[PDB]
């Protein structure tokens, strides 16, 4: 399950290929437009909320 | 009331009946002013429409209908259904191979106004064309002439 990630305050974008099950658990059972603190996505996502 | 035999109050829309004038007007007489028009192609309005009290909106002289189109004539055949009659028109159709004619007829339903009273089924009626008044009615009686056995 690949992730399209965009940062609107700068304009940079890339697609990240993720083949893990723990990272997708937080996103499961959620709706669109729900700002959620995705901290399990990686080490740099500690303070990032998407 | 004879004039008020239906579920809705019957009146001539052009006429206003509630002019509060004076107590004397109440004391004097209660007779409504009546709306009558001159349906005019040389025809005359019968005096039973200017002096009558019936309320019918498909009458030509005291109703909301206009007479335009064709003026025809016929013989009254049946007076059975409410306020409309059936008349007969007889004509000859020409067949040209034999150079001869044949009798044909048409049955036409017309509206009869209460201003035309004392009319029996033998007599000549003139009819004028108007707008569709029902499914099979487009003409209206404009003059009544008594039959051969005239009294």
């Amino acid at each position: 399950m690949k992730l399209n990630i965009s940062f609107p305050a700068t304009g940079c974008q890339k697609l990240i290929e993720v083949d893990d099950e723990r990272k997708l658990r937080t996103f499961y059972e959620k709706r669109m437009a729900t700002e959620v603190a995705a901290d399990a996505l990686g080490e740099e996502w500690k303070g990032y909320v998407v | 009331a004879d004039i008020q035999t239906e579920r809705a109050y019957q009146k001539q829309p052009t006429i206003f009946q509630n002019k509060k004038r004076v107590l004397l007007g109440e004391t004097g007489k209660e007779k409504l002013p009546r709306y009558y028009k001159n349906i005019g192609l040389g025809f005359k309005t019968p005096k039973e429409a200017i002096e009558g009290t019936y309320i019918d909106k498909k009458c030509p002289f005291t109703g909301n209908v206009s007479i335009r189109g064709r003026i025809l004539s016929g013989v009254v055949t049946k007076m059975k259904m409410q306020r409309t009659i059936v008349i007969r028109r007889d004509y000859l159709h020409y067949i040209r191979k034999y150079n001869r004619f044949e009798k044909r007829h048409k049955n036409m339903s017309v509206h009869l106004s209460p201003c035309f009273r004392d009319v029996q089924i033998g007599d000549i009626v003139t009819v004028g064309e108007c707008r569709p008044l029902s499914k099979t009615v487009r003409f209206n009686v404009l003059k009544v002439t008594k039959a051969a056995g005239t009294k």
Binding site: - | L41, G42, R68, I71
Partner: protein, 262 residues
């Protein structure tokens, strides 16, 4: 059909256009305008077919888009514009003025007029009513709405219109003894004096008209256009002067011409 039509077949076109069978399948369908489809002459059939200033329909467009043709004082770049009875066509480049007047055979004539005569036209009266705040309004056969007219002008009259301003300068009433032209029916193009008018209420009236040679005919009241007061027309007349010749008289008048030649 699910809507209005936009084509006209050549055999279905008005016969007085004088269109031949083998030029095409189609004919110019007149644009919507002041005159009816069956009682008008489009600008293409006048510039190309009558005056022969153009050889094809593409050349009519090249004349029109140069803004050379004025119909009653206004430039029209539409090549199927419905010009009609009593209209004035002005070509300033060649200094020509024409008036659309029927000839005795029922067809529009090439009737050239002077620059002074091109400053006015005669219009029949179709409707008179009163509009908001009590202002009288006219409607003519040219689809002209003229407000504040004289109260003596009634329906079936004729008015004179100055094409620069569009205002009434004079008028002629409808009465016996007045000159008129027939603009429809079987007497189309004929000129004569009104003698009688028989009234049929609930139906069409009938007007009797007598020629200058003593021939009498009748028309429906809607087909009568009052031209002048008495015997004197208010506009210039075509060559035939409105008199319908019989076929024998026409034959003799044609045969006499070729004997004169020599």
């Amino acid at each position: 059909a699910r809507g209005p039509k936009k084509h006209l077949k050549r055999v279905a076109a008005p016969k007085h256009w004088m269109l031949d069978k083998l030029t095409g399948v189609f004919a110019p369908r007149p644009s919507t305008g002041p005159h009816k489809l069956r009682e008008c002459l489009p600008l293409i059939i006048f510039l190309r077919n009558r005056l022969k200033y153009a050889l094809t329909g593409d050349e009519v467009k090249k004349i029109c888009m140069q803004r050379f043709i004025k119909i009653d004082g206004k430039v029209r770049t539409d090549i199927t514009y419905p010009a009609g009875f009593m209209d004035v066509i002005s070509i300033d480049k060649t200094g020509e003025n024409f008036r659309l007047i029927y000839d005795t055979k029922g067809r529009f004539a090439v009737h050239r007029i002077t620059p002074e005569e091109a400053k006015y036209k005669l219009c029949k009266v179709r409707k008179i009513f009163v509009g908001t705040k009590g202002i009288p309004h006219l409607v003519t056969h040219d689809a002209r709405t003229i407000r504040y007219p004289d109260p003596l002008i009634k329906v079936n009259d004729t008015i004179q219109i100055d094409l620069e301003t569009g205002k009434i300068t004079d008028f002629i009433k409808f009465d016996t003894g007045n000159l008129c032209m027939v603009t429809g029916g079987a007497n189309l193009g004929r000129i004569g004096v009104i003698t009688n008018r028989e009234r049929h209420p609930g139906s069409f009236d009938v007007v009797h008209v007598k020629d200058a040679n003593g021939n009498s005919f009748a028309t429906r009241l809607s087909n009568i256009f009052v031209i002048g007061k008495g015997n004197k027309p208010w506009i210039s007349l075509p060559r035939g002067k409105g008199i319908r010749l019989t076929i024998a008289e026409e034959r003799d008048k044609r045969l006499a011409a070729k004997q004169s030649s020599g």
